[PDB]
Amino acid sequence: TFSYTLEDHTKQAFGIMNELRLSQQLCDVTLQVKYQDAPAAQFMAHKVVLASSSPVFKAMFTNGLREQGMEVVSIEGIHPKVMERLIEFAYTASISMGEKCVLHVMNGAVMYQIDSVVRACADFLVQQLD
Ligand SMILES: C=C1C(=O)O[C@H]2C[C@@H](C)[C@@H]3[C@@H](OC(C)=O)C[C@H](O)[C@@]3(C)[C@@H](OC(C)=O)[C@H]12
Numbered sequence: 189t190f191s192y193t194l195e196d197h198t199k200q201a202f203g204i205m206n207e208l209r210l211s212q213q214l215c216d217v218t219l220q221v222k223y224q225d226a227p228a229a230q231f232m233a234h235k236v237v238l239a240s241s242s243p244v245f246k247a248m249f250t251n252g253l254r255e256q257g258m259e260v261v262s263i264e265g266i267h268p269k270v271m272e273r274l275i276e277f278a279y280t281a282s283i284s285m286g287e288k289c290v291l292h293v294m295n296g297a298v299m300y301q302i303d304s305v306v307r308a309c310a311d312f313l314v315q316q317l318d
Pocket of ligand 1: 269270
C-alpha cells in the first residue's frame with residue numbers, strides 16, 4: 189500500500205483560491221457591507237472558503253436546498269476595512285492592521301467567530317498593557 193502527503197498542498201491551493209477571489213472567478217457570494225457613514229463596499233468570495241474559516245459564515249451558507257449561484261448578503265455592523273481583512277485572513281492565513289485598528293478587527297473576528305484572530309488580537313491588546 190503506497191501512501192503520499194504533500195505538506196505544502198493546502199498552502200498552494202489557498203494561494204490559487206485567493207487568485208480566483210481577486211479575479212472574481214467561481215465566486216458565489218457578494219458581501220455588501222454598509223457601515224453607518226462609510227461608503228458601501230462589496231466583496232465577492234466563495235462560500236465554501238468563508239465557511240471553512242468562520243462558523244458564522246458556514247451557518248449562514250449551509251441551508252438545505254438553496255440559491256443557484258450569486259447570493260448577495262447584507263453586512264451591517266462591521267466596517268468594510270475590517271471585513272476586507274477577515275476575508276484576507278480566510279484566503280491567506282494572514283492578517284495585518286495599524287495598531288489603532290486591532291480592536292475593530294477583534295470586534296469583527298468575534299462577530300464571525302474567527303477564533304484564531306480573536307486570540308491574536310487579545311494577546312496583542314493585553315501585551316500593549318503596563
Ligand atoms: C484602520 C481602519 C479599520 O480597520 O477599520 C476602521 C474603523 C473606523 C470606524 C475608523 C473610524 O473611527 C472613528 C473614530 O470614527 C475613523 C477611521 O478613519 C476609521 C475609518 C479607520 O481608521 C482607524 C485607525 O480607526 C479604521
